[PDB]
Structure formats: C-alpha cells, structure tokens
C-alpha cells in the first residue's frame, strides 16, 4: 500500500502499558485508505530515533475506524509523529 498523505487525530488518551510502552489510538482524515501510516519518533533536539515502533506496518483500513499503534518512547523528553507533512500530529512525551 501507498503511504497515507492525510492528517491524523487522537481518538483517545495515550495509554501507558506496564512494559514501558505507549498505545496511541489514531483516527485518519484522508481519502486514500487502505494506506500505510507514516510514523516516526524524535529526541528533545528533534533528531530521528530509530526502531521505537512496536506495531509492525501500521495501516488504515477504513477512515471511520481508528488504528492502535504501540511505540516505545526513550527515557526523558521525546516526540511521537503520526502522519506526513509539516502539519502532522506531533506529540510531546516524557517517560
């Protein structure tokens, strides 16, 4: 599938698991589903931190239905980015 070009919203509060990860429930606003969810994690400085995504190949099936995304944030301040473009959903996180 092609990468999602649209915007994402949070369907519910970000939930902390009992294994140092977070569950992000995202809602897709674009019209190009089925599509692959653009996902990235950054440090306080804004440098991309690799291999933090737990959910393998997150995909939007139906835009009306939200998608669960599990990610492992690093210790301290970080940023969880869902979607493509400069206007993408950027979540400030502290672990």
């Amino acid at each position, epitope marked *: 599938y092609v990468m999602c070009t649209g915007s994402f919203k949070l369907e*519910k509060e970000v939930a902390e698991t009992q294994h140092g990860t977070v569950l992000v429930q995202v809602k897709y606003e674009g019209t190009d589903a089925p599509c692959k969810i653009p996902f990235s994690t950054q440090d306080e400085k804004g440098v991309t931190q690799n291999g933090r995504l737990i959910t393998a190949n997150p995909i939007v099936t139906d835009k009306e239905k939200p998608v669960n995304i599990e990610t492992e944030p690093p210790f301290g301040e970080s940023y969880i980015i869902v979607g493509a473009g400069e206007k993408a959903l*950027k979540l400030s996180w502290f672990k």
Partner: single-chain antibody
Amino acid sequence: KLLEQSGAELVKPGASVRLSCTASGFNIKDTYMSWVKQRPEQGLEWIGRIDPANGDTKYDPKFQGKATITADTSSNTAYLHLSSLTSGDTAVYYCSRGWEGFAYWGQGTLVTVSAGGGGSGGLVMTQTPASLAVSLGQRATISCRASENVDRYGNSFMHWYQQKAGQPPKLLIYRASNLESGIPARFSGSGSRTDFTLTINPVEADDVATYFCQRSNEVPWTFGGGTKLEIKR
C-alpha cells in the same frame, strides 16, 4: 449520518427517561461517546463521556445526580439516563463521538417535561462576544479564554463549532488551528494554553450561525457560552 438517536420524548415531572444513540460504520468500543444538552435557544452543555472499551464514565459536576451514561458495545449503542425530571431538563440532547473535537453528532432528541410538580436539579470557559453583528466581507473574530491550561502532549485541545438554526453543531477547527475536512479556508484558529481565537475572514452570508469553542484535554470538556453571529441590521 453515522449516529442515530431515539425519538422525541414527552415525560412527566419527577419521572425518569432514557435516550439512545446507535452508531453505524464504526465500533463505539473504539471511541469516546459524549452527551451534550441544549436548552431552547441556549448554549451547548457537555454532560459527560463514556469510553465503551472499559466502561469509564466522566461527568461535568453540574450533572452529578441528574445524568448517567451507559453503553453496550454488542448493540453499538450509547445511552443517557436522566433522573427526577424538571422543566430545567427540557432540551435537545445530542450524542457525539470524538476527543479532538466532536466530528460526529447525532440528530438530537427533544425531551419535553410536561407541566406539574416534582423532580430536582441534583473550569470556566469565557467566550466573547456573546453577540456579533458583522458586515459581510469583514474579518470576524471570536475569543475563548479558559481558567486552566488546555494543552496536552504539546498540543492545545481547543475546538470550534458552527451551529445553524434547527441543526446539530458542526466541527470547524480542532486542536486550536487545524481545519476540519470540508471546511472553507476562510475559517482559521489560533492560540495556545488558555487564550484562543476563531477568525472568519472574509465573513459570508452563509456564516450566520452560533459558534462555540470547547476544551477537551481534561474533563470536563466544557463549551464556551457561544457567539450568535448575525449580519448587521
């Protein structure tokens, strides 16, 4: 419309009533379902929300001892239960879905409390101006000030709605500055933490409506008092 509500109710004072809200196309389990009260010609009042995945309920303190919210994921339905009905309960009740603004609304259910004795009644959002007389083609500005910080995860959970006569509200802006899909570019939002602004530039004839801001970072997900926008007379 993906949210279908039960029919109008005519109920006796002191009695109880249950309203239903059935979803189609998506699982209510995967969302936050809210109930919103609107007394005749008055503002939107957030009653509470249920997370049907775990059954968690949160209410505005004003509704404690008046409203109860339940959900049934099996039948994809959310319910509102009102106790000891009084004239103050006569209103249109809407169900809605969403956290970063309510993009989905039911058509509303009118509850009319009949005449007679019986029943009992049981964060600050400052929206200005209460009334706005506009010149078409001008820049129209509506402000909302919260008594507490509305930011979460470095984003401002401030949303804006438009409501036209005899219609449910429509989401315009979410997360303070993000334009809802299908909304014209003349609508823009700005602000952070406690101070926010909705700008309509240039204002057009079809923008005549009542506008509401709302915060949702933490409960209660309080609406502003509203701004009735009309063309100057």
